[PDB]
Amino acid sequence: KLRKFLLRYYPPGIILQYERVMKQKPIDLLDLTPDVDVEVLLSQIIRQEPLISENRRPALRQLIHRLIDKMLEFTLFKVLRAHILPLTNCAFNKSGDRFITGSYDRTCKVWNTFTGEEVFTLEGHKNVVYAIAFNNPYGDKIVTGSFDKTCKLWDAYTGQLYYTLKGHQTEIVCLSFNPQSTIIATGSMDNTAKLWDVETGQERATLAGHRAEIVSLGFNTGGDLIVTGSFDHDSRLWDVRTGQCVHVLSGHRGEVSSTQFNYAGTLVVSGSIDCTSRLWDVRSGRCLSVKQGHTDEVLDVAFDAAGTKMVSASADGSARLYHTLTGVCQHTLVGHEGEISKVAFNPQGTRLITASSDKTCRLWDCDTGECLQVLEGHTDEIFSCAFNYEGDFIITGSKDNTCRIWKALT
């Protein structure tokens, strides 16, 4: 029995709240353009969904109009010295009103991005805290992965330590909660990933098979599958419930640097030190596309929120921006004097930011490829840049051990 409709803007969608206890069932409108014929779309929504009856069509119509009206619509907010010893990572929560930092001082700090207050100092690790993450629709739990082979689970509101996850034989170098925040994944330099249960802390599975370090992780939107990128030149698709590898995605002639699912969960993009990015079919595990044109290592790959466009960042100082379905290269973004470590789309998929070793983060227009803004102020390389969920705030992390928060015009 349907109880509520909720609008999702990034990527477009409509969430179905029911009574049966509350799950939410999503209507994903990934290919929504402003010129959509609304009645055909409304008709197939009511047809596809047995919980949506004909009488809800007027409500459905106004929701879709708000989504269309939303497609028809940066200054320094704060500088914060996070640590004295090397800053390794930084990450927003969903809203952006909190961010976490990890360091060579074996801590993860929780920061109030409005006030600059260091809310908590998470201590107990005995080596570099290298990877950190929020359970980031919710933001109430924090996972820290360290070179002391261990991963810690914390409460973001009390600072309290829930669990210490032991089992890896070597440094932990990447991690992620799943979307439902029920399972933690840690990838290590012992060539394995491990899945852990958040409520019990007990290890749930070990994902073995890679022949070298796991540099990259990622769950799909449904928490159904997980991809791992590895120095053995492969990425692997794993089923989170069985614990088994479903596909080995080979084609990279060099170690994988980055991996990511599209929102639909039907594609993976990997970038690699062999100067290429690759597009894979999840269903069959085959390579749909090899994307060259970069002259130096590809360091980061991203889809936009909907997955209609994809971008690759390289050591050649450029970002190449493609259209996912056709594969056409729309723009090559030149301008950075250094290598490009990180790239992100805004939630609306209309602009793009890049973090570079030239101590600069640039804002680009996806339609024209013009550099809209050059974000300056860091005194060393920028290793990171990310938007909050709405795109009004950006966080850059640098090797100057400083975080800079940027805010969009009001």
Swiss-Prot record:
Spans of repeat WD: 82-121, 124-164, 167-206, 209-250, 252-290, 293-332, 335-376, 378-410
Main location: cytoplasm
Location relative to the cell: Cytoplasm, Cytoskeleton, Flagellum basal body; Cytoplasm, Cytoskeleton, Flagellum axoneme
InterPro entries hit by this protein: G-protein_beta_WD-40_rep, WD40/YVTN_repeat-like_dom_sf, WD40_repeat_CS, WD40_repeat_dom_sf, WD40_rpt
Pfam families to which the protein is assigned, alphabetical: WD40
SUPFAM superfamilies associated with the record: WD40 repeat-like
Keywords: Cell projection, Cilium, Cytoplasm, Cytoskeleton, Flagellum, Repeat, WD repeat
A GO CC term assigned to this protein in UniProt: motile cilium
GO BP terms: intraciliary transport; outer dynein arm assembly
Subunit description: Interacts with IFT46 and FLA10.
PANTHER family: PHOSPHOLIPASE A-2-ACTIVATING PROTEIN
Physiological role: Functions as a cargo-specific adapter between intraflagellar transport (IFT) particles and outer row dynein. Required for efficient dynein-mediated transport into the flagellar compartment.
Protein name: Dynein assembly factor with WD repeat domains 1
Organism expressing this protein natively: Chlamydomonas reinhardtii (Chlamydomonas smithii)
